[PDB]
């Protein structure tokens, strides 16, 4: 291929513009359909009040009951299911507590054995969840 001629710049510019869309990466980054789909709605973190709590069976092969709180974001009233990091840290979370939830880490993809869960709890009731696990602060 590679049409090359001294006066063929327009054909090449059009091909790059049309072809660049094919990659999932350009589309997810620029089509912006994802922005509307994103519960986080283009934010690193979102503040939501816990509406439900549950245990999600870990994807086989790994087996455990991962502890999560279903939270509706205050910003868009959009449901999110968020993993609670650390050991036995769901005890820190209480229903209706209000949490700040940040991305799990794969830019909108479920991470690890947890199935179809893209978010994690970083703060509970104004106190960092890691700090609660590390005993830096109490309740």
């Amino acid at each position: 291929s590679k049409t090359s001629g001294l006066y063929t710049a327009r054909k090449l510019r059009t091909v790059r513009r049309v072809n660049r869309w094919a990659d999932k990466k350009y589309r997810k980054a620029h089509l912006g359909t994802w922005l509307k789909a994103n519960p986080l709605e283009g934010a690193c973190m979102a503040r939501g009040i816990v509406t439900q709590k549950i245990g999600i069976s870990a994807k086989q092969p790994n087996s455990a009951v991962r502890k999560a709180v279903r939270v509706q974001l205050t910003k868009n009233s959009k449901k999110i299911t968020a993993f609670v990091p650390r050991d036995g840290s769901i005890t820190y979370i209480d229903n209706n507590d209000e949490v700040l939830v940040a991305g799990f880490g794969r830019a909108g993809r479920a991470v690890g054995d947890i199935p179809g869960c893209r978010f994690k709890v970083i703060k509970v009731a104004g106190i960092g969840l890691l700090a609660l696990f590390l005993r830096k602060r109490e309740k």
Binding site: S4, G5, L6, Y7, T8, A9, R10, L12, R13
Partner: protein, 77 residues
């Protein structure tokens, strides 16, 4: 048009990323004086003038005739 011509002027625009160029054409309205008689394809030396109408800011200053059929031929003179 009535005592007016839409002069087409050709030109090249260079893109640096692909060192190739893009032939770009523009249309400009010009007043044709009755003293001159032009057929489509002729070369006309338009000279800038007072905004004479909505689209006419140029006025033919000289005409050199061309043949009936010699091909469209991109010319950026």
């Amino acid at each position: 048009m009535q005592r007016s011509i839409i002069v087409r002027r050709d030109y090249l625009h260079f893109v640096q990323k692909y060192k190739r160029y893009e032939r770009r054409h523009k249309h400009v309205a010009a007043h044709l004086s009755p003293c001159f008689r032009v057929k489509e394809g002729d070369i006309v030396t338009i000279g800038e003038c007072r905004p004479l109408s909505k689209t006419i800011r140029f006025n033919v200053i000289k005409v050199e005739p061309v043949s009936e059929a010699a091909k469209k031929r991109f010319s950026p003179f």
